[PDB]
Amino acid sequence: DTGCAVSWSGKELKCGSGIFVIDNVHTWTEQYKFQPESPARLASAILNAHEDGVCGIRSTTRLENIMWKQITNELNYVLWEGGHDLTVVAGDVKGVLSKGKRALAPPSTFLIDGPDTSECPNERRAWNFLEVEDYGFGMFTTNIWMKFREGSSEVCDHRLMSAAIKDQKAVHADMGYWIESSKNQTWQIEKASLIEVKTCLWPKTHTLWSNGVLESQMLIPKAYAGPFSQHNYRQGYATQTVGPWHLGKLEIDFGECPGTTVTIQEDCDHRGPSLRTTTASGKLVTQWCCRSCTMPPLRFLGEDGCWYGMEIRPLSEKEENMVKSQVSA
Amino acid sequence: DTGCAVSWSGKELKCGSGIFVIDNVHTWTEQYKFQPESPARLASAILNAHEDGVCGIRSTTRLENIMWKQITNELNYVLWEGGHDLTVVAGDVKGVLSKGKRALAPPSTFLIDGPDTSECPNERRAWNFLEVEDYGFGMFTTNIWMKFREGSSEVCDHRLMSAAIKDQKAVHADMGYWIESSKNQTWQIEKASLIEVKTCLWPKTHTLWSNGVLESQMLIPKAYAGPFSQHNYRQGYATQTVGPWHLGKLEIDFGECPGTTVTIQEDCDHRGPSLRTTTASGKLVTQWCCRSCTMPPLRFLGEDGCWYGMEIRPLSEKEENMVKSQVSA
Amino acid sequence: DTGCAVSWSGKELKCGSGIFVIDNVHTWTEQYKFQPESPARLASAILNAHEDGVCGIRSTTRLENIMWKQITNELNYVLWEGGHDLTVVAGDVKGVLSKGKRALAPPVNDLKYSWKTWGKAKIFTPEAKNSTFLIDGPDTSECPNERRAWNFLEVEDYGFGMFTTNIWMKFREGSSEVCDHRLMSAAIKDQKAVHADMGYWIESSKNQTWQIEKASLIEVKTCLWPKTHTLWSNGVLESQMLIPKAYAGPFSQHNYRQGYATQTVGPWHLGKLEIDFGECPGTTVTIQEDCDHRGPSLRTTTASGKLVTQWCCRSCTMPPLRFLGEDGCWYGMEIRPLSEKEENMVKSQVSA
Amino acid sequence: DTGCAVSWSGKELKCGSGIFVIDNVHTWTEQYKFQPESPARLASAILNAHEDGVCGIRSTTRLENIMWKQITNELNYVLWEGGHDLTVVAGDVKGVLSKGKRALAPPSTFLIDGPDTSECPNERRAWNFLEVEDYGFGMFTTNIWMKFREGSSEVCDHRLMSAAIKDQKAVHADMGYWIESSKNQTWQIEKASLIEVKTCLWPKTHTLWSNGVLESQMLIPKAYAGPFSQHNYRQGYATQTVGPWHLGKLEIDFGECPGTTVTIQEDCDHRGPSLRTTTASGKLVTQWCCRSCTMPPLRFLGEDGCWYGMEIRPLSEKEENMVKSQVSA
């Protein structure tokens, strides 16, 4: 990586060569774009899946849904000019990028993404069947060429991932993940910006300090592409398995949501699904408590409000008439 | 940080904010002038440790040898001002930075560094009792402040280390280490640029893919501050315990020494100590073979000549009239 | 700010911190998420303004129209739940963003609404009623611009992003005719200057003199450019500003071109514009002493469909001024036809 | 200028083309390669000026003084090679870069800079006769080409300065000036970094808000290359014509120097020359009083001490036994 960067304290310009790990979620200008391989190959793969009995596909990344939406008309043209009665419908991403149990091999209605339905579940939908072939060119926005995978795997594509550590600051980056960490008497996670919630597994070749990791202590659960590292850990908290993951984009941070107070009281209820501060009628709950936390509290900053972690419980409301996370069990 | 990665061939510019790992080994332009916390505190430390049986100290990094050489005169002046009979001589480090067995807890001739002697063995010498507390400012020189450690540990200081991975390239950087990994159908080490040979342990908080690692497969042994990971690995080889580590400055790369050939055969003996291509007489050995290595063979590039790994043994020349590795087997 | 630039013609990367002014030619965003002060405060202000005789509002920029189109449904829901006979209709922008002569003063004793923020509630389109509160749209007679509010909001905090951008607005303390400065900029370095904005990008350069070079307008505002964000703002004559101050042209001497005066009756009725200096295809412009005086700006192609090729000028300087719109080519206020009168031609709809 | 930049959050990555105003005062550049017209032309112009009656020159900027010091030896050599009895002597600047009343037209001692004496009256020296032609680079070979002016001008050269404003932060930049302004309920100056004190005039083509400006309200006077702007203003202060401008390198900031307090009260003496906090002996005065200023007070942070503005007078000690500004009233 030829080039160099200035420090965060104004002017400490170190210049040389090495490996650069750069934030991608917090950008105004798009920096990466997905490009398919050929309209002819994708149409043949879709027809082969239709013969096999595949209803549709489930996008793995929010940058892949755009790529699938951008070629729907061309796929429809190719399918129509073949004597085949088939229609490809491009949906939109809403909630968790759920995983299917099917894949697409290299060469009615075919529904792509879309809201979860019962006519054809994710049981027979194709998921995680693209691999990065190489990187293209472009002054500011570089494009990425995709290819069909050889087989099937639950591990995310490792050609789009990063991980770095320097002095007392680590990071586990991705195209839609940015998980930070720091050291203050302990190595623990401090913030995590997510523009999506995927499901494939984080590979262990791109993780820092991935030994002795206990699966029940990972703040971002392994089922939601959380790194299998000890930097993915916060003291006093366990895995947030029933958090507000249905929101889609999240902003994990440590602090207090505006207008509320959290106190450590042993006379508190056990862990349960994450609750929103504002009631469904707009009323705010301003008194919360938790058993054995570590201040400051853990909050998720979604689009519809500020949530709390799985261990913090209210003291003002009965929790019967409060909106909770939609993650089932 | 904040900076850009450029590609002069073509047009590319990847800017943003994140973590940037820069090659600090290939600098050849600056020497940091270390400044301890208190000259009176240090003199008290050596004076207190003198009666405890500590004959001297041994450096852990090639940078603190410089500060000891710089401040030995001021230490002697302070000792003279204190009206005490003690003399301190700052020697030079040549070869492996040996490991002591004592420590200077905070409050004849006291030998700092230098060659091993029977009257002052390293088993009565202190080792690894300073740590970096803060960083300085400046381009010509940076003031690195060092303070006494609270406890005693065999792990190297983590405030100077870093590690990164992106796409298909990894690196385990340091102030005197530069290990690079790359993926070609498998992750394996490809080159290393060591300007020193330490003895402390690489921290597991700064390693990538440190799960399921066997000590009998690390190309750079953990006794010489080799990262405890699976990127530090090469197919067909094992731990290079008896390699040419006494040279000090090293250069690990895979290839052929000029005018030599290595062939796959079952007619050679087992692995042994590292050997030079050129003999004590001055001639050059051309016929080499390995039992189960992989081409290109492991090659060490020191000041004296071009060495081989432990698994490459000569086929024509006799091992009894050539120089072996001075490290104990 | 922090960041740095590359010079392809050669090798150099000067990298540091300062103030960086960048255009919007490489940036795109999908969704805006506006957030005015409160659903109950804004609805109360609108109701009071309607009771005072203000029968509508008129947008001051192009983001304001998007905001109103987005929040109209919740405004209607609040007004219906309050049991008041009033419906809000949000229209489009066609041409110049005209200016009204009223304002919404901050209310007292606002309406009753449980939520304190926009969009985080379930609503529905209640009904239509006999009284309307028009927001923008085509100009009519029942709501002239004299009884329409204008320029009564200003942003306070904002955040941009690739997928979602957030902007917070608030009521203005008083009434003013000056555009909001919290999203515009201006810079100069060496022999190049720029007067940027969210919809304006004016470039000036030096070649023996300082004069305007090219301007790209995606909107035609009407508020004044603040003088705190203006370079070389001393000794400027209002009759020499190429982009008149009535259309948010900076009160600068960089906003100037030799041989031309203010273009009052230019083709501003188009909205999107691209001012540049050159010759439109298939036409030739000369300088003569017997040409006609300046008048309404004209188009190269007549209404029938055929173009004219002989144009002349009296006192301008080559290359001629040129307006590039969706309709076609429009010459400057000084270039006049020679081989065909302006009669068989379409002229600027701006009133003269 | 094509490039990409972030904001003061680390977010909102915008890549594109525009105008980039970058801090050049705090650049830590140590190598400069100035290229004047020609050794044959400068010597001829100097000889003609000396024949006309000029006895020396006065540098307009620090870089010009560096250039003259670098090229003085070659100028002397080329002047001697032609058989002319003249020697060029290059000195160093101390304080304000004073201005001369002559110029060099295109084609026994000749002093450059240095102290002030009767050998060369300040009205018999050349000043502001060179202008920039081409620009330099960005790693270590910044090469600026100079060229003779056509006529005599007292305005600073515009090829090297800039100015920018964005939201609520402005800046007036140069190679030796860095003046910052901000909006906190009103537009007023915030801080200024001055590594030199010039005497030419800031051109009004590179000035923001240069209308309705009253000459007596500019914090940095018009005679010291202060911008003719309304951003160059502080509420409660007037022109600092008799400030500590004789220091040279300076740092204008608002606050209280350590160990002193300022209180606004109606009883106080009128304005006057600026004076240091500490007296000649070394006693630090602790009590000061304004008359109509606004807190925090204006202070100049020089290389010898912390000064105050013309409005902050001392009350606990007479000004007779204190060091005052050396600039003539």
Side-chain angles (χ1 to χ4, degrees):
Chain A
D1 287 80
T2 307
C4 50
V6 300
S7 189
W8 63 274
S9 296
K11 177 51 68 158
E12 289 85 4
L13 176 45
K14 56 182 181 180
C15 205
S17 178
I19 286 190
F20 293 0
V21 168
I22 295 168
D23 186 4
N24 185 268
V25 290
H26 297 122
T27 57
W28 189 1
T29 295
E30 59 180 359
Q31 301 275 326
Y32 292 88
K33 183 62 71 178
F34 278 43
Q35 299 292 322
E37 57 181 3
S38 177
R41 288 186 71 92
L42 295 160
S44 63
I46 277 160
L47 178 52
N48 291 320
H50 199 262
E51 194 272 331
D52 183 276
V54 175
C55 286
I57 72 167
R58 280 281 172 188
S59 298
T60 305
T61 314
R62 276 199 57 182
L63 260 188
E64 172 177 336
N65 178 255
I66 317 177
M67 187 271 287
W68 281 109
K69 284 215 306 278
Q70 197 176 3
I71 58 176
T72 317
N73 51 4
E74 294 179 353
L75 287 175
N76 273 318
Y77 299 159
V78 177
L79 269 177
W80 181 40
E81 302 196 331
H84 298 86
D85 296 333
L86 189 61
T87 298
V88 177
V89 178
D92 51 354
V93 164
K94 53 182 74 174
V96 186
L97 291 168
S98 311
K99 68 184 290 294
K101 294 182 178 68
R102 185 69 73 188
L104 277 193
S108 66
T109 60
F110 205 85
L111 199 152
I112 283 185
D113 285 327
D116 208 320
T117 197
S118 63
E119 64 179 0
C120 188
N122 299 318
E123 183 44 73
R124 55 181 185 269
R125 268 160 176 252
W127 170 79
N128 203 20
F129 49 89
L130 281 73
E131 190 175 2
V132 172
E133 184 179 2
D134 57 353
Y135 282 43
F137 64 93
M139 191 177 288
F140 308 121
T141 299
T142 180
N143 50 3
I144 297 171
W145 302 102
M146 298 324 263
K147 69 187 286 184
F148 281 125
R149 294 176 73 97
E150 293 98 352
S152 61
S153 68
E154 292 91 5
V155 188
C156 312
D157 211 352
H158 83 264
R159 297 210 49 170
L160 304 150
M161 284 181 173
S162 302
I165 190 167
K166 194 172 198 293
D167 194 36
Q168 285 173 348
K169 178 175 170 64
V171 71
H172 293 76
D174 201 307
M175 287 298 170
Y177 274 38
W178 180 260
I179 302 147
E180 303 221 356
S181 169
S182 64
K183 188 169 203 292
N184 288 316
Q185 292 295 319
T186 307
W187 275 106
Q188 47 195 357
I189 178 179
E190 69 179 2
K191 62 184 287 293
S193 301
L194 317 183
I195 68 169
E196 64 183 358
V197 170
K198 65 181 77 173
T199 305
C200 53
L201 289 191
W202 196 284
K204 276 172 210 180
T205 68
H206 291 70
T207 69
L208 292 155
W209 193 11
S210 85
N211 60 4
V213 161
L214 193 64
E215 193 162 280
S216 85
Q217 299 299 110
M218 289 162 51
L219 206 75
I220 306 194
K222 182 177 98 89
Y224 291 99
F228 210 89
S229 69
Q230 274 177 63
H231 296 85
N232 177 16
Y233 158 89
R234 188 60 178 228
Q235 205 146 34
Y237 297 88
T239 180
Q240 313 278 283
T241 177
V242 190
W245 306 115
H246 75 281
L247 295 177
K249 63 185 77 66
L250 273 78
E251 179 77 30
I252 295 196
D253 197 1
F254 285 86
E256 291 180 350
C257 302
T260 61
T261 304
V262 181
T263 73
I264 296 93
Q265 182 179 3
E266 282 293 334
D267 193 353
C268 169
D269 197 2
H270 55 274
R271 297 179 68 198
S274 180
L275 310 159
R276 188 164 55 137
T277 56
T278 63
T279 317
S281 176
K283 187 202 169 56
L284 172 58
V285 189
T286 58
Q287 296 280 58
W288 303 74
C289 78
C290 80
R291 185 176 293 173
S292 52
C293 298
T294 59
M295 295 297 114
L298 158 67
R299 68 198 169 111
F300 311 91
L301 283 154
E303 65 179 0
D304 52 9
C306 195
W307 300 60
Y308 291 167
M310 194 170 174
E311 293 88 8
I312 306 169
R313 303 280 97 182
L315 281 176
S316 295
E317 291 275 358
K318 200 186 287 185
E319 193 260 1
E320 178 67 28
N321 54 4
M322 296 181 70
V323 64
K324 64 183 179 181
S325 80
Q326 293 182 357
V327 189
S328 52
Chain B
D1 296 334
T2 302
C4 306
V6 297
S7 302
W8 297 120
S9 63
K11 306 297 188 290
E12 289 183 357
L13 188 78
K14 299 289 94 176
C15 308
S17 72
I19 292 174
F20 303 87
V21 171
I22 301 293
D23 192 345
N24 277 290
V25 158
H26 299 287
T27 186
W28 291 97
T29 50
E30 69 267 15
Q31 301 267 76
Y32 298 147
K33 294 181 181 179
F34 288 6
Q35 196 266 330
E37 54 179 356
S38 293
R41 192 173 174 91
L42 291 175
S44 175
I46 296 89
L47 191 143
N48 205 358
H50 185 266
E51 65 183 4
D52 201 69
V54 171
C55 172
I57 65 170
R58 291 212 154 283
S59 297
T60 70
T61 311
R62 192 173 291 275
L63 276 74
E64 69 180 2
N65 168 252
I66 295 170
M67 75 179 284
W68 284 124
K69 279 201 188 180
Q70 163 195 349
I71 77 174
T72 180
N73 262 322
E74 185 176 0
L75 274 171
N76 276 269
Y77 175 82
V78 170
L79 278 170
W80 195 93
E81 291 306 307
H84 310 298
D85 278 331
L86 201 46
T87 307
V88 171
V89 185
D92 186 72
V93 55
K94 180 175 47 200
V96 179
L97 273 72
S98 295
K99 178 170 71 176
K101 303 293 178 67
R102 296 281 216 282
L104 281 72
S108 57
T109 303
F110 207 81
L111 279 76
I112 294 185
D113 277 323
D116 293 332
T117 183
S118 301
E119 307 293 328
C120 192
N122 79 302
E123 56 92 16
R124 288 163 94 228
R125 276 171 185 241
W127 178 78
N128 197 27
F129 49 97
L130 281 73
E131 68 187 12
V132 167
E133 74 180 6
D134 272 324
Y135 282 162
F137 61 93
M139 187 270 286
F140 282 150
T141 181
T142 297
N143 213 13
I144 288 173
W145 305 66
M146 294 195 139
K147 69 184 289 183
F148 276 93
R149 280 162 98 113
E150 184 63 81
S152 310
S153 66
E154 302 187 326
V155 188
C156 313
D157 202 353
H158 81 271
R159 297 221 50 173
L160 293 166
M161 307 198 153
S162 64
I165 184 153
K166 186 170 73 171
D167 185 48
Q168 275 174 347
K169 291 182 182 294
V171 66
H172 284 76
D174 193 11
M175 283 267 157
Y177 273 41
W178 187 264
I179 295 96
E180 286 181 356
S181 297
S182 297
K183 163 146 202 161
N184 179 16
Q185 293 180 356
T186 309
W187 285 93
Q188 41 188 19
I189 189 174
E190 66 173 17
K191 71 170 291 180
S193 299
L194 320 187
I195 66 187
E196 65 183 344
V197 180
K198 286 131 69 177
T199 316
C200 52
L201 300 199
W202 194 281
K204 288 181 181 179
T205 72
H206 288 77
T207 69
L208 294 157
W209 197 12
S210 63
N211 67 278
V213 193
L214 296 160
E215 294 179 353
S216 69
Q217 287 283 84
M218 297 161 57
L219 200 71
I220 310 182
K222 70 184 290 184
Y224 299 108
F228 198 88
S229 82
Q230 303 207 41
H231 291 85
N232 173 22
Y233 162 78
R234 187 54 178 238
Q235 182 61 255
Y237 297 96
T239 303
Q240 302 276 341
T241 317
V242 186
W245 301 105
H246 62 81
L247 297 166
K249 280 80 68 179
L250 264 191
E251 180 73 27
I252 296 178
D253 51 355
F254 291 82
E256 293 288 334
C257 299
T260 60
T261 311
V262 182
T263 68
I264 309 295
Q265 264 181 354
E266 286 284 338
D267 292 332
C268 64
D269 52 322
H270 39 62
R271 61 181 290 164
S274 180
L275 310 174
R276 279 200 288 180
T277 53
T278 185
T279 78
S281 173
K283 67 151 300 187
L284 191 145
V285 190
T286 311
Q287 292 307 124
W288 304 80
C289 63
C290 61
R291 184 176 288 169
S292 178
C293 73
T294 65
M295 292 295 104
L298 182 55
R299 156 175 55 126
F300 295 101
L301 284 176
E303 287 85 4
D304 58 1
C306 186
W307 296 68
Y308 280 159
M310 292 179 69
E311 293 184 354
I312 297 90
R313 313 302 295 165
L315 185 63
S316 48
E317 194 70 26
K318 295 181 177 67
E319 313 190 3
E320 56 90 23
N321 45 52
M322 67 172 72
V323 285
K324 62 189 286 291
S325 180
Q326 296 159 350
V327 189
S328 71
Chain C
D1 281 292
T2 308
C4 60
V6 62
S7 189
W8 304 118
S9 183
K11 312 300 180 83
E12 66 187 1
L13 209 68
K14 158 79 189 153
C15 200
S17 61
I19 290 174
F20 305 96
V21 172
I22 298 168
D23 56 1
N24 290 30
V25 66
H26 279 90
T27 69
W28 283 269
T29 185
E30 283 93 9
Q31 183 63 256
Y32 287 88
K33 297 298 288 295
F34 290 98
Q35 188 76 39
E37 54 278 14
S38 293
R41 189 171 172 90
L42 198 53
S44 175
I46 281 175
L47 179 71
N48 285 135
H50 170 244
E51 288 184 354
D52 288 332
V54 185
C55 74
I57 75 171
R58 180 73 68 182
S59 299
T60 183
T61 181
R62 193 171 289 276
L63 286 185
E64 195 149 317
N65 186 246
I66 298 171
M67 175 187 73
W68 288 115
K69 292 168 88 70
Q70 158 175 334
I71 71 188
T72 305
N73 282 317
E74 192 166 1
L75 270 175
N76 283 301
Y77 185 68
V78 175
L79 284 174
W80 183 70
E81 184 179 1
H84 325 284
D85 292 330
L86 186 50
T87 181
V88 176
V89 177
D92 294 331
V93 288
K94 310 173 185 294
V96 185
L97 307 182
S98 299
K99 64 187 299 295
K101 278 78 178 175
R102 300 291 204 104
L104 281 72
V108 61
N109 317 328
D110 51 356
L111 296 187
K112 179 260 289 180
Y113 194 65
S114 47
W115 295 93
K116 290 178 70 68
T117 45
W118 300 89
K120 293 183 281 292
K122 184 180 184 295
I123 62 170
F124 60 90
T125 54
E127 265 179 350
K129 292 180 174 67
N130 310 274
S131 297
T132 57
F133 192 86
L134 301 170
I135 294 184
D136 259 277
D139 198 348
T140 57
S141 174
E142 78 283 347
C143 282
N145 280 344
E146 196 268 327
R147 320 189 300 130
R148 284 216 188 196
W150 178 76
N151 205 21
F152 57 94
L153 288 153
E154 50 167 352
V155 304
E156 44 169 0
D157 285 325
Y158 62 95
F160 281 116
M162 175 172 64
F163 283 121
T164 299
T165 71
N166 280 77
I167 292 172
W168 288 264
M169 290 187 182
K170 75 177 173 73
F171 271 135
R172 188 183 289 267
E173 291 178 352
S175 62
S176 49
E177 293 175 351
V178 162
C179 309
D180 195 29
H181 69 267
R182 279 204 56 99
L183 274 188
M184 64 173 65
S185 62
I188 182 161
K189 179 181 215 185
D190 191 25
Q191 293 180 326
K192 291 183 187 295
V194 71
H195 281 94
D197 198 340
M198 289 296 289
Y200 275 40
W201 179 269
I202 305 168
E203 291 182 356
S204 169
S205 68
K206 184 183 204 296
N207 190 21
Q208 296 181 359
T209 55
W210 286 86
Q211 41 195 13
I212 198 168
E213 185 183 3
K214 69 178 76 68
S216 71
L217 316 178
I218 73 169
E219 63 184 0
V220 190
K221 296 194 285 269
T222 317
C223 49
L224 308 186
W225 198 280
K227 320 196 86 167
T228 81
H229 293 62
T230 290
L231 294 156
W232 199 7
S233 176
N234 70 299
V236 187
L237 293 169
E238 294 183 24
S239 66
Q240 309 299 326
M241 289 165 54
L242 200 79
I243 307 194
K245 69 182 291 185
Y247 293 118
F251 203 84
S252 177
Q253 279 182 275
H254 298 288
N255 169 38
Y256 162 83
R257 186 81 186 189
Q258 214 172 346
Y260 297 99
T262 185
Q263 313 273 301
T264 301
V265 180
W268 307 108
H269 69 87
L270 300 168
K272 279 79 65 179
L273 284 174
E274 188 96 13
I275 302 179
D276 56 352
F277 293 82
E279 275 198 359
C280 274
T283 59
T284 285
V285 180
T286 65
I287 294 171
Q288 322 189 356
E289 201 263 312
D290 62 324
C291 293
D292 205 285
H293 63 284
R294 58 182 288 164
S297 178
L298 294 154
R299 186 173 83 200
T300 47
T301 298
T302 64
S304 82
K306 58 172 307 305
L307 76 164
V308 303
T309 65
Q310 299 288 133
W311 298 76
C312 74
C313 179
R314 178 177 287 178
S315 159
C316 60
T317 60
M318 300 298 106
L321 183 51
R322 154 180 77 163
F323 298 95
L324 278 174
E326 188 274 332
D327 217 354
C329 172
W330 297 71
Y331 279 165
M333 197 168 177
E334 270 85 12
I335 296 91
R336 308 303 300 164
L338 189 65
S339 68
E340 157 59 57
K341 11 100 195 45
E342 346 80 65
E343 287 81 285
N344 316 352
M345 292 180 180
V346 294
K347 64 178 70 65
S348 193
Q349 294 169 162
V350 164
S351 54
Chain D
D1 293 330
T2 186
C4 185
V6 304
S7 82
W8 273 351
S9 45
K11 297 178 182 179
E12 295 179 355
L13 183 66
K14 210 200 200 150
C15 297
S17 295
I19 286 174
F20 295 159
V21 172
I22 302 172
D23 202 323
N24 277 335
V25 169
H26 299 90
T27 194
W28 299 7
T29 299
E30 298 293 328
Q31 292 83 20
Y32 279 145
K33 290 179 72 175
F34 309 110
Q35 291 258 357
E37 285 195 353
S38 179
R41 305 186 52 80
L42 288 174
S44 181
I46 284 174
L47 187 66
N48 285 114
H50 190 86
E51 301 298 290
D52 200 1
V54 188
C55 71
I57 76 169
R58 281 275 167 203
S59 305
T60 313
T61 318
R62 186 187 64 183
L63 305 188
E64 185 175 1
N65 181 252
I66 295 177
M67 175 187 75
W68 283 114
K69 288 191 289 185
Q70 279 190 355
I71 73 173
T72 303
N73 283 3
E74 187 174 1
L75 261 58
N76 285 318
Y77 180 70
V78 68
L79 191 55
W80 174 85
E81 282 278 329
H84 305 101
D85 194 358
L86 198 81
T87 294
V88 180
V89 177
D92 292 330
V93 300
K94 46 176 71 176
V96 288
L97 304 154
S98 309
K99 70 181 282 208
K101 302 296 188 293
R102 312 288 288 263
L104 299 203
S108 179
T109 176
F110 207 71
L111 298 149
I112 297 182
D113 285 308
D116 296 330
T117 183
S118 45
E119 191 71 13
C120 275
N122 218 307
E123 67 270 14
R124 294 179 67 249
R125 285 177 171 248
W127 177 81
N128 213 43
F129 57 93
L130 290 197
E131 62 178 359
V132 170
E133 191 154 57
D134 290 351
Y135 286 153
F137 272 93
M139 61 292 292
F140 64 100
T141 48
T142 55
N143 188 355
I144 288 157
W145 302 76
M146 302 276 208
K147 184 254 294 178
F148 275 88
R149 285 184 188 268
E150 283 90 4
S152 61
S153 55
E154 64 184 2
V155 193
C156 300
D157 172 60
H158 81 270
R159 295 296 299 268
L160 300 146
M161 44 188 65
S162 84
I165 191 164
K166 189 173 181 179
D167 291 338
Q168 280 164 340
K169 292 173 188 296
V171 69
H172 287 78
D174 196 344
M175 294 280 177
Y177 279 38
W178 183 263
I179 296 155
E180 294 184 356
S181 170
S182 311
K183 174 145 194 287
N184 184 226
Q185 193 176 2
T186 186
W187 279 102
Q188 47 188 17
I189 196 175
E190 186 184 4
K191 70 179 72 66
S193 300
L194 277 69
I195 64 180
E196 69 186 347
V197 178
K198 293 177 291 205
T199 315
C200 50
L201 305 180
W202 200 280
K204 290 178 184 177
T205 70
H206 295 74
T207 303
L208 291 156
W209 202 7
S210 83
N211 81 291
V213 166
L214 192 64
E215 183 182 358
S216 297
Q217 301 300 296
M218 295 166 28
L219 203 67
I220 310 188
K222 191 186 181 175
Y224 297 101
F228 206 76
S229 176
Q230 300 210 33
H231 291 58
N232 175 41
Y233 175 71
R234 193 55 179 228
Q235 198 193 315
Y237 305 85
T239 54
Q240 315 281 306
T241 61
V242 186
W245 301 115
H246 67 283
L247 290 186
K249 296 176 72 71
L250 204 65
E251 181 78 29
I252 290 192
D253 202 318
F254 290 84
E256 293 175 351
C257 310
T260 64
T261 60
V262 193
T263 57
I264 299 164
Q265 64 185 0
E266 60 92 16
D267 61 276
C268 176
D269 46 351
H270 59 89
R271 296 206 316 162
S274 176
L275 57 87
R276 204 163 52 189
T277 53
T278 64
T279 177
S281 80
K283 172 199 155 40
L284 187 143
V285 181
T286 46
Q287 295 298 110
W288 312 77
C289 53
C290 279
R291 201 145 89 170
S292 64
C293 78
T294 56
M295 302 282 119
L298 169 63
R299 61 176 175 86
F300 308 90
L301 185 66
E303 71 267 13
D304 68 339
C306 200
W307 296 62
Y308 291 166
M310 314 186 49
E311 290 92 0
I312 305 143
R313 299 290 91 192
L315 63 93
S316 76
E317 180 64 27
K318 294 182 179 67
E319 69 275 16
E320 61 94 16
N321 54 27
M322 300 180 72
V323 286
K324 62 167 191 173
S325 81
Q326 196 55 255
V327 291
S328 176

